[PDB]
């Protein structure tokens, strides 16, 4: 009974949480890359095309 309960309940429940946390962290990295691109573009414009 204990073996079947551990095999059918606990392990997929932990695995889903791991997957969810991985997706959230990856989405946050994908979000901050966009801001880095924007500030690099702002650096390029003001330091090369002003007079």
């Amino acid at each position: 009974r204990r073996v079947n309960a551990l095999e059918q309940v606990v392990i997929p429940g932990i695995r889903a949480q791991i997957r969810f946390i991985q997706q959230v962290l990856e989405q946050r990295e994908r979000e901050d890359t966009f801001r880095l691109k924007r500030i690099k573009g702002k650096i390029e414009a003001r330091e090369a095309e002003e007079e």
Partner: protein, 468 residues
């Protein structure tokens, strides 16, 4: 009409190219790009201003240069020439024939983006469609004017189910009390991201059935340019709307894989440097999908109808992935395939519990099909939602908890999964599907069938198992 050419290319990078003096290009216009070698490419204006215009190229930009490239306007609005002779023909993802036959003679040129239907002009879908599959027809029935996608996984027979539905689906008018009369039925088939092994299977099945004479196929291979993947379903829907609402046809539209469409949409947007969404897909994906799914339905005062059955493959059993999620918010139900039923050999593996049809209550009842359809559907569903939980509890504890009536009930559930859901390549009618269901219903006492009224019990109960 005279043509015009612009040669002021100033900047080429990735898929985009800039034209300097092109102020007279309309927004969203379609252009053709010719270089020194004479090869002609396609393009679309995505942003126009006073200083320059931005054009994205439909294919790769290899071989382009700022010295000899010229851009010529084709037309301001992307249009498709449609005709009634397109039945029986095959087209690629941009609308050119690929069968080798001479090109069609257009009747009208219609914009492929379409227009939204007036909600006052619509009417309620009410007519039932007999598909031949007992799990679909009885518990999750399909109505003319519906959009009912099929949720599938990787390694499941979605294509075979789609082909079977294409072969077997028709409406029987004599059951509705209106009297028997023939009705023109047509199929529009759109395929994107399809490999040669699947293309040959679809072509061979359509030719063997003999249904090619009344069908139009839009096919896009996996090595084709990705813009044709975006433009493929819009042309199929443009043809279907024209046929249905200008020739009184009943057209069934099948989209073979929307996952490839969403991937192609992600590839296009990410090169234009905009903010992504939930898993990198663009944030306007809901609107783009809604401009496709919402074109079906029925129109008041017109005999035609459009029905959509998209097929999409989930990356996992992940019901929360953005593609099936955003498909669920727009469509009117779902048919979900089960890996457990496929593993033990049941075909077709439709799982009744996550499945749902939101327009079932309008197409069933008195006067349509038979008066006992809804009662039989309720009684067939009434067992499963508790039997599955009983089986889950048994898988941990065992056989000790089961009583005798529970053993009978679980035997009925096993026979249900073995006979009703599993039918193979059958072509059951609605009458014989109801007879099979009633033969399963006669394996339980009348006092336990708490859904059906005793009038229906007095004329349908007691039939022994028919498929043996």
């Amino acid at each position: 009409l005279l043509k015009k050419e612009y040669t002021g290319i100033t900047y080429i990078s990735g898929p985009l190219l800039f034209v300097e003096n092109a102020k007279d290009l309309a927004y969203g216009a379609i252009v053709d790009i010719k270089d020194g070698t004479g090869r002609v490419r396609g393009g679309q204006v995505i942003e126009v201003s006073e200083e320059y215009a931005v054009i994205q190229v439909f294919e790769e930009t290899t071989g382009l240069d700022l010295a000899t490239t010229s851009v010529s306007l084709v037309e301001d609005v992307a249009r498709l020439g449609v005709s009634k002779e397109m039945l029986g023909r095959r087209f690629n993802g941009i609308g050119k024939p690929i069968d080798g036959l001479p090109p069609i003679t257009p009747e009208k040129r219609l914009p492929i983006t379409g227009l939204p239907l007036n909600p006052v002009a619509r009417r309620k879908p009410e007519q039932f469609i007999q598909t031949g599959i007992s799990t679909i027809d009885v518990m999750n029935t399909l109505v003319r004017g519906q959009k009912l996608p099929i949720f599938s996984g990787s390694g499941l027979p979605a294509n075979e189910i789609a082909a079977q539905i294409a072969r077997q689906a028709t409406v029987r008018p004599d059951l509705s009390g209106e009297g028997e009369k023939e009705e023109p039925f047509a199929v529009v088939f759109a395929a994107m991201g399809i490999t040669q092994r699947e293309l040959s299977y679809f072509i061979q099945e359509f030719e063997r059935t003999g249904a090619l004479s009344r069908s139009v196929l839009f096919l896009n291979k996996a090595d084709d340019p990705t813009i044709e993947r975006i433009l493929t379903p819009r042309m199929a829907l443009t043809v279907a709307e024209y046929l249905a609402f200008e020739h009184d046809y009943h057209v069934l539209v099948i989209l073979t894989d929307m996952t490839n469409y969403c991937e192609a949409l992600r590839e296009i947007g990410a090169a234009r440097e905009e903010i992504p969404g939930r898993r990198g897909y663009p944030g306007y994906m809901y609107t783009d999908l809604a401009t496709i799914y919402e074109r079906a339905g029925v129109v008041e005062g017109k005999k035609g109808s459009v029905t959509q059955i998209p097929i999409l493959s989930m990356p996992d059993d992940d019901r929360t992935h953005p593609i099936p999620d955003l498909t669920g918010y727009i469509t009117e139900g779902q048919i979900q395939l089960s890996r457990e039923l496929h593993r033990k050999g049941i075909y077709p593996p439709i799982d009744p519990l996550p499945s749902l049809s939101r327009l079932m209550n309008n197409g069933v009842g008195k006067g349509k099909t038979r008066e006992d359809h809804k009662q039989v559907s309720d009684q067939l569903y009434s067992a499963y939602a508790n039997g599955v939980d009983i089986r889950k509890l048994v898988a941990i504890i065992g056989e000790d908890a089961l009583t005798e009536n529970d053993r009978r009930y679980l035997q009925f559930a096993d026979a249900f999964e073995r006979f009703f859901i599993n039918q193979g390549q059958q072509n059951r009618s609605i009458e014989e599907s109801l007879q099979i269901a009633w033969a399963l219903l006669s394996m339980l006492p009348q006092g336990e069938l708490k859904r059906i009224s005793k009038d229906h019990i007095g004329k349908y109960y007691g039939q022994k198992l028919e498929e043996i």
